[PDB]
Specification:
Subtilisin is an extracellular alkaline serine protease, it catalyzes the hydrolysis of proteins and peptide amides. Has a high substrate specificity to fibrin. It is an enzyme of class 3 (hydrolase). Its EC number is 3.4.21.62. Belongs to the peptidase S8 family. It catalyses: Hydrolysis of proteins with broad specificity for peptide bonds, and a preference for a large uncharged residue in P1. Hydrolyzes peptide amides. With 275 residues, the chain is an alpha/beta fold. The protein has a single domain, classed as 3-Layer(aba) Sandwich (Rossmann fold). It is 31% helix and 17% strand. The strands form two sheets. The protein has a seven-stranded parallel beta sheet, sandwiched between helices. The radius of gyration is 16 Å and the shape is globular. The structure holds calcium ion (2 copies). The site of one calcium ion has 7 residues, from loops.
């Protein structure tokens, strides 16, 4: 029996699935710790690894990558869970090792690979407190080339009156995603700031884990894939839409929750976004 995680229903993806919009032929790159391609509920189309000591991108020694992937595209079948865009062409771009960290050059190299291989959407459930001219250059190049770039806002919470949104989420070209729970309330760990763009479910998110398992995790990392998948559904319905049109639609059809410093434009509604 297959279970639909609350987050998928909360952003109204199932509505599009029933109309036949499930993200087919849309290439999504999960820049992360790799994806367990042997998972029964996932179908990885390709990828690459830029982690010198972990050359197989289809082997996830952390579990973060596979979990994020499950939210983006777990298969619509009779087992496990259901992704936001279950027909999406999932790519494993391994830039984080078994411990969950990665050097910025590995991350950047992964972004470059994604651009060169024409990914339609890039998901980055990662980030740090500092940026680099090289980091900004890679994400800005992606967008100029028509790629939709989504990134977790961070899990720094509030801090006086200043932004805690991390990089690359902080760059204007990158969509920054914070997390809310099932009640649409902001998760205390969610980063805040004028850079926040939109919110998506990010608490107790059930998804795939390596070794044919399932578990729930909480983090803006779990929030991000919901919007990456959202963009993919919009593109399956509107293949001619550019990345800036896909973003404006997601940003302009949100359910307003409080102040934008904390909730950005609000929770995404993929049904309304897809028009
Ligand atoms: Ca499934
Ligand atoms: Ca941004």
């Amino acid at each position: 029996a297959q279970s639909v995680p609350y987050g998928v229903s909360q952003i109204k993806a199932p509505a599009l699935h029933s109309q036949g919009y499930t993200g087919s032929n849309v290439k999504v790159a999960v820049i992360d710790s790799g994806i367990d391609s042997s998972h029964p509920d996932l179908k990885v189309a390709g990828g690459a690894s830029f982690v010198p000591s972990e050359t197989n991108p289809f082997q996830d020694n952390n579990s973060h990558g596979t979990h994020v992937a499950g939210t983006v595209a777990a298969l619509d079948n009779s087992i496990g869970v259901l992704g936001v865009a279950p027909s999406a062409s999932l790519y494993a771009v391994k830039v984080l090792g078994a411990d969950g960290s990665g050097q910025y050059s590995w991350i950047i190299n992964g972004i470059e690979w994604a651009i060169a291989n024409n990914m339609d959407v890039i998901n980055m459930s990662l980030g740090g407190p500092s940026g680099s001219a090289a980091l900004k250059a890679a994400v800005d190049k992606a967008v100029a080339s028509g790629v939709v770039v989504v990134a977790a806002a961070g899990n720094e919470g509030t801090s006086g009156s200043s932004s805690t949104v991390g990089y690359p989420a902080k760059y204007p070209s990158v969509i920054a995603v914070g997390a809310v729970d099932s009640s649409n309330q902001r998760a205390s760990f969610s980063s805040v700031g004028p850079e926040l763009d939109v919110m998506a479910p990010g608490v107790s998110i059930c998804s795939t884990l390596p070794g044919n398992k399932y578990g729930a995790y909480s983090g803006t990392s779990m929030a991000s894939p919901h919007v990456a998948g959202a963009a993919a559904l919009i593109l399956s319905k509107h293949p001619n839409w550019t990345n800036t049109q896909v973003r404006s639609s997601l940003e302009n059809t949100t359910t307003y929750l409080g102040d934008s410093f904390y909730y950005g434009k609000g929770l995404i509604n993929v049904q309304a976004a897809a028009q």
